[PDB]
Enzyme design. Structure first.
Site, PDB file in Angstrom:
ATOM      1  N   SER A 173       0.792  -1.221   0.000  1.00 11.98           N
ATOM      2  CA  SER A 173       0.000   0.000   0.000  1.00 11.98           C
ATOM      3  C   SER A 173       0.818   1.261   0.000  1.00 11.98           C
ATOM      4  O   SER A 173       0.183   2.328  -0.046  1.00 11.98           O
ATOM      5  CB  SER A 173      -0.925   0.041   1.209  1.00 11.98           C
ATOM      6  N   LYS A 183      -0.039   3.686  -2.655  1.00 16.03           N
ATOM      7  CA  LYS A 183      -1.198   4.576  -2.598  1.00 16.03           C
ATOM      8  C   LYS A 183      -0.762   6.043  -2.604  1.00 16.03           C
ATOM      9  O   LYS A 183      -1.528   6.911  -3.036  1.00 16.03           O
ATOM     10  CB  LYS A 183      -2.040   4.233  -1.373  1.00 16.03           C
ATOM     11  N   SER A 196      -5.650   3.229   4.386  1.00 12.63           N
ATOM     12  CA  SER A 196      -5.173   2.207   3.456  1.00 12.63           C
ATOM     13  C   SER A 196      -6.351   1.476   2.809  1.00 12.63           C
ATOM     14  O   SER A 196      -6.253   0.299   2.474  1.00 12.63           O
ATOM     15  CB  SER A 196      -4.210   1.240   4.142  1.00 12.63           C
ATOM     16  N   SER A 233       1.458  -3.320   3.781  1.00 13.23           N
ATOM     17  CA  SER A 233       1.687  -4.673   4.238  1.00 13.23           C
ATOM     18  C   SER A 233       1.080  -5.616   3.214  1.00 13.23           C
ATOM     19  O   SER A 233       0.204  -5.242   2.427  1.00 13.23           O
ATOM     20  CB  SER A 233       1.114  -4.902   5.641  1.00 13.23           C
TER      21      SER A 233
END
Length: 263
Positions: A45, A48, A105, A212
Protein backbone atom coordinates in the site's frame (compact mmCIF):
# COMPACT_ATOMS: atom_id res chain seq x y z
CA UNK A 1 28.49 7.60 10.50
CA UNK A 2 26.84 5.76 7.60
CA UNK A 3 28.84 2.54 7.95
CA UNK A 4 27.92 2.29 11.63
CA UNK A 5 24.22 2.69 10.79
CA UNK A 6 24.49 0.15 7.96
CA UNK A 7 26.12 -2.37 10.26
CA UNK A 8 23.32 -1.91 12.78
CA UNK A 9 20.72 -2.28 10.04
CA UNK A 10 22.48 -5.44 8.91
CA UNK A 11 22.30 -6.76 12.49
CA UNK A 12 18.61 -5.85 12.55
CA UNK A 13 17.99 -7.70 9.29
CA UNK A 14 19.86 -10.80 10.47
CA UNK A 15 17.91 -10.95 13.72
CA UNK A 16 14.64 -10.35 11.87
CA UNK A 17 14.73 -13.38 9.60
CA UNK A 18 13.74 -11.32 6.60
CA UNK A 19 15.05 -8.92 3.95
CA UNK A 20 15.32 -5.27 4.95
CA UNK A 21 15.54 -2.31 2.60
CA UNK A 22 16.20 1.20 3.96
CA UNK A 23 16.69 4.59 2.36
CA UNK A 24 17.21 7.71 4.45
CA UNK A 25 17.60 11.15 2.89
CA UNK A 26 18.72 13.83 5.31
CA UNK A 27 17.74 17.08 3.63
CA UNK A 28 20.03 19.10 5.90
CA UNK A 29 22.98 18.06 3.71
CA UNK A 30 21.30 15.68 1.20
CA UNK A 31 23.22 12.72 2.50
CA UNK A 32 21.68 9.35 1.79
CA UNK A 33 22.03 6.23 3.87
CA UNK A 34 21.00 3.07 2.09
CA UNK A 35 20.66 -0.56 3.02
CA UNK A 36 19.69 -2.74 0.05
CA UNK A 37 18.72 0.63 -1.42
CA UNK A 38 18.77 -0.60 -5.02
CA UNK A 39 17.02 -3.92 -4.47
CA UNK A 40 13.39 -4.25 -5.49
CA UNK A 41 10.77 -4.75 -2.76
CA UNK A 42 6.99 -5.16 -3.08
CA UNK A 43 5.48 -1.75 -2.32
CA UNK A 44 2.09 -2.97 -1.13
CA UNK A 45 0.00 0.00 0.00
CA UNK A 46 2.90 2.43 -0.05
CA UNK A 47 1.94 2.73 -3.75
CA UNK A 48 -1.20 4.58 -2.60
CA UNK A 49 0.97 7.70 -2.17
CA UNK A 50 1.79 7.71 -5.89
CA UNK A 51 -1.88 7.27 -6.82
CA UNK A 52 -3.02 10.07 -4.50
CA UNK A 53 -0.23 12.28 -5.78
CA UNK A 54 -1.18 11.60 -9.40
CA UNK A 55 -4.80 12.56 -8.79
CA UNK A 56 -3.56 15.71 -7.07
CA UNK A 57 -1.49 16.42 -10.19
CA UNK A 58 -4.63 15.97 -12.32
CA UNK A 59 -6.44 18.55 -10.16
CA UNK A 60 -3.82 21.17 -11.06
CA UNK A 61 -5.50 21.47 -14.43
CA UNK A 62 -9.02 20.09 -13.75
CA UNK A 63 -10.33 22.66 -11.31
CA UNK A 64 -12.63 21.25 -8.62
CA UNK A 65 -11.53 17.71 -9.58
CA UNK A 66 -11.11 16.73 -5.93
CA UNK A 67 -14.72 17.67 -5.22
CA UNK A 68 -16.17 15.50 -7.96
CA UNK A 69 -18.43 12.69 -6.73
CA UNK A 70 -17.43 9.16 -7.68
CA UNK A 71 -19.97 6.34 -7.45
CA UNK A 72 -19.03 3.43 -5.19
CA UNK A 73 -20.61 0.29 -6.72
CA UNK A 74 -20.78 -3.28 -5.36
CA UNK A 75 -18.28 -4.37 -7.99
CA UNK A 76 -15.81 -1.90 -6.42
CA UNK A 77 -15.87 -3.58 -2.99
CA UNK A 78 -12.92 -5.68 -1.88
CA UNK A 79 -11.70 -7.25 1.34
CA UNK A 80 -10.30 -4.24 3.21
CA UNK A 81 -12.23 -1.06 2.60
CA UNK A 82 -13.29 0.40 5.95
CA UNK A 83 -14.32 3.81 4.57
CA UNK A 84 -15.59 3.04 1.06
CA UNK A 85 -17.91 0.21 2.11
CA UNK A 86 -19.86 2.82 4.08
CA UNK A 87 -20.64 4.51 0.76
CA UNK A 88 -21.57 1.57 -1.44
CA UNK A 89 -24.34 2.60 -3.84
CA UNK A 90 -23.52 6.19 -2.94
CA UNK A 91 -20.63 8.50 -3.74
CA UNK A 92 -17.36 9.77 -2.38
CA UNK A 93 -15.38 12.69 -3.74
CA UNK A 94 -11.88 12.12 -5.07
CA UNK A 95 -10.63 14.06 -2.04
CA UNK A 96 -12.46 11.66 0.24
CA UNK A 97 -11.12 8.68 -1.70
CA UNK A 98 -7.59 10.05 -1.44
CA UNK A 99 -7.90 10.58 2.29
CA UNK A 100 -9.37 7.09 2.74
CA UNK A 101 -6.62 5.46 0.68
CA UNK A 102 -3.86 7.33 2.50
CA UNK A 103 -5.13 7.50 6.06
CA UNK A 104 -6.82 4.11 6.33
CA UNK A 105 -5.17 2.21 3.46
CA UNK A 106 -8.67 1.61 2.04
CA UNK A 107 -8.32 -0.69 -0.97
CA UNK A 108 -11.58 0.23 -2.64
CA UNK A 109 -10.54 3.87 -2.44
CA UNK A 110 -7.17 3.01 -3.96
CA UNK A 111 -8.91 1.19 -6.78
CA UNK A 112 -11.01 4.24 -7.54
CA UNK A 113 -7.82 6.36 -7.63
CA UNK A 114 -6.10 3.85 -9.95
CA UNK A 115 -9.15 3.92 -12.19
CA UNK A 116 -9.18 7.72 -12.19
CA UNK A 117 -5.58 7.60 -13.48
CA UNK A 118 -6.32 5.17 -16.31
CA UNK A 119 -5.23 2.00 -14.55
CA UNK A 120 -1.97 0.83 -13.06
CA UNK A 121 -0.26 1.90 -16.27
CA UNK A 122 -1.49 5.43 -15.58
CA UNK A 123 -0.07 5.47 -12.10
CA UNK A 124 3.23 4.20 -13.53
CA UNK A 125 3.13 6.90 -16.23
CA UNK A 126 2.80 9.59 -13.53
CA UNK A 127 5.86 8.16 -11.76
CA UNK A 128 7.79 8.33 -15.02
CA UNK A 129 6.59 11.91 -15.61
CA UNK A 130 8.16 12.97 -12.32
CA UNK A 131 11.41 11.18 -13.04
CA UNK A 132 10.88 7.88 -11.21
CA UNK A 133 12.05 5.17 -13.60
CA UNK A 134 11.94 2.38 -10.98
CA UNK A 135 8.35 2.40 -9.66
CA UNK A 136 6.02 0.02 -11.40
CA UNK A 137 2.37 -0.57 -10.65
CA UNK A 138 1.01 -3.61 -12.43
CA UNK A 139 -2.17 -4.64 -10.63
CA UNK A 140 -5.16 -3.21 -8.82
CA UNK A 141 -5.54 -2.97 -5.07
CA UNK A 142 -6.90 -6.45 -4.15
CA UNK A 143 -3.88 -8.19 -5.72
CA UNK A 144 -0.90 -5.81 -5.73
CA UNK A 145 -0.03 -6.91 -2.16
CA UNK A 146 0.81 -10.55 -2.90
CA UNK A 147 4.52 -9.70 -2.44
CA UNK A 148 5.78 -12.99 -3.93
CA UNK A 149 9.61 -13.26 -3.94
CA UNK A 150 11.03 -12.89 -7.43
CA UNK A 151 7.91 -11.16 -8.73
CA UNK A 152 8.78 -7.72 -10.14
CA UNK A 153 5.17 -6.54 -10.27
CA UNK A 154 4.24 -3.64 -8.00
CA UNK A 155 7.80 -3.08 -6.79
CA UNK A 156 10.29 -0.29 -6.36
CA UNK A 157 13.62 0.25 -4.60
CA UNK A 158 14.12 2.10 -1.31
CA UNK A 159 16.34 4.67 -3.00
CA UNK A 160 13.80 5.39 -5.74
CA UNK A 161 10.87 5.66 -3.37
CA UNK A 162 12.70 7.96 -0.97
CA UNK A 163 13.71 10.23 -3.83
CA UNK A 164 10.14 10.28 -5.12
CA UNK A 165 8.56 10.85 -1.72
CA UNK A 166 10.98 13.73 -1.20
CA UNK A 167 10.06 15.28 -4.57
CA UNK A 168 6.33 14.93 -3.85
CA UNK A 169 6.30 16.37 -0.30
CA UNK A 170 9.36 18.66 -0.10
CA UNK A 171 10.19 19.23 -3.78
CA UNK A 172 8.25 20.61 -6.71
CA UNK A 173 6.58 17.60 -8.29
CA UNK A 174 3.20 19.02 -7.20
CA UNK A 175 1.76 22.51 -7.07
CA UNK A 176 1.86 24.19 -3.71
CA UNK A 177 -1.80 23.65 -2.81
CA UNK A 178 -1.52 20.02 -3.90
CA UNK A 179 1.74 19.46 -2.01
CA UNK A 180 0.23 20.90 1.17
CA UNK A 181 -2.81 18.67 0.71
CA UNK A 182 -0.67 15.56 0.26
CA UNK A 183 1.35 16.36 3.36
CA UNK A 184 -1.81 17.09 5.36
CA UNK A 185 -3.16 13.68 4.38
CA UNK A 186 0.11 11.90 5.29
CA UNK A 187 0.32 13.66 8.66
CA UNK A 188 -3.19 12.35 9.36
CA UNK A 189 -2.37 8.71 8.71
CA UNK A 190 -4.02 6.39 11.23
CA UNK A 191 -2.12 3.17 10.41
CA UNK A 192 1.50 4.09 11.20
CA UNK A 193 1.74 4.24 14.98
CA UNK A 194 3.69 0.98 15.27
CA UNK A 195 5.99 1.53 12.28
CA UNK A 196 8.45 4.41 11.63
CA UNK A 197 6.60 6.64 14.13
CA UNK A 198 7.28 4.21 16.98
CA UNK A 199 11.02 4.56 16.49
CA UNK A 200 11.02 8.35 16.56
CA UNK A 201 10.61 10.98 19.26
CA UNK A 202 6.99 11.99 19.74
CA UNK A 203 7.89 15.68 19.37
CA UNK A 204 8.86 15.06 15.73
CA UNK A 205 6.15 15.54 13.12
CA UNK A 206 5.66 12.61 10.77
CA UNK A 207 3.68 12.07 7.59
CA UNK A 208 3.76 8.46 6.49
CA UNK A 209 2.11 5.72 4.53
CA UNK A 210 2.39 2.10 5.64
CA UNK A 211 1.99 -1.01 3.61
CA UNK A 212 1.69 -4.67 4.24
CA UNK A 213 1.08 -7.79 2.25
CA UNK A 214 1.90 -11.41 1.79
CA UNK A 215 5.22 -12.89 2.86
CA UNK A 216 4.94 -10.81 6.01
CA UNK A 217 5.74 -7.74 3.97
CA UNK A 218 5.76 -4.70 6.23
CA UNK A 219 6.55 -1.29 4.76
CA UNK A 220 6.46 2.37 5.68
CA UNK A 221 7.52 5.53 3.89
CA UNK A 222 7.74 8.77 5.80
CA UNK A 223 8.58 12.44 5.66
CA UNK A 224 9.85 13.53 9.08
CA UNK A 225 10.15 17.04 10.46
CA UNK A 226 12.41 16.79 13.51
CA UNK A 227 12.96 19.60 15.86
CA UNK A 228 16.38 21.18 15.62
CA UNK A 229 17.25 20.02 12.09
CA UNK A 230 15.99 19.83 8.52
CA UNK A 231 13.41 17.24 7.40
CA UNK A 232 14.24 13.59 6.79
CA UNK A 233 12.77 11.19 4.25
CA UNK A 234 12.78 7.57 5.40
CA UNK A 235 11.71 4.46 3.49
CA UNK A 236 11.66 1.12 5.34
CA UNK A 237 10.70 -2.00 3.39
CA UNK A 238 10.68 -5.46 4.92
CA UNK A 239 9.69 -8.88 3.60
CA UNK A 240 10.05 -12.43 4.83
CA UNK A 241 10.54 -15.89 3.32
CA UNK A 242 7.29 -17.56 4.49
CA UNK A 243 4.14 -16.68 2.57
CA UNK A 244 2.17 -16.49 5.85
CA UNK A 245 4.75 -14.57 7.89
CA UNK A 246 3.26 -12.12 10.36
CA UNK A 247 3.67 -8.39 9.88
CA UNK A 248 6.67 -6.92 11.73
CA UNK A 249 5.88 -3.23 12.17
CA UNK A 250 8.23 -3.32 15.16
CA UNK A 251 11.12 -4.09 12.82
CA UNK A 252 10.38 -0.90 10.90
CA UNK A 253 10.26 0.96 14.21
CA UNK A 254 13.68 -0.47 15.02
CA UNK A 255 14.97 0.68 11.64
CA UNK A 256 13.66 4.18 12.31
CA UNK A 257 15.21 4.22 15.79
CA UNK A 258 18.63 3.23 14.43
CA UNK A 259 18.35 6.05 11.89
CA UNK A 260 17.05 8.60 14.38
CA UNK A 261 19.78 7.76 16.91
CA UNK A 262 22.65 7.35 14.51
CA UNK A 263 22.37 10.17 11.97
Amino acid sequence: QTSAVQQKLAALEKSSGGRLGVALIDTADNTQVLYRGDERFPMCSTSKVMAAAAVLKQSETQKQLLNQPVEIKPADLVNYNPIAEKHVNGTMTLAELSAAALQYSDNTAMNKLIAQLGGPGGVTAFARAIGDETFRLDRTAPTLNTAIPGDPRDTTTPRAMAQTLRQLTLGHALGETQRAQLVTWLKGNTTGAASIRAGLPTSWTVGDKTGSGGYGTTNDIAVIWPQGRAPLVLVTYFTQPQQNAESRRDVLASAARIIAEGL
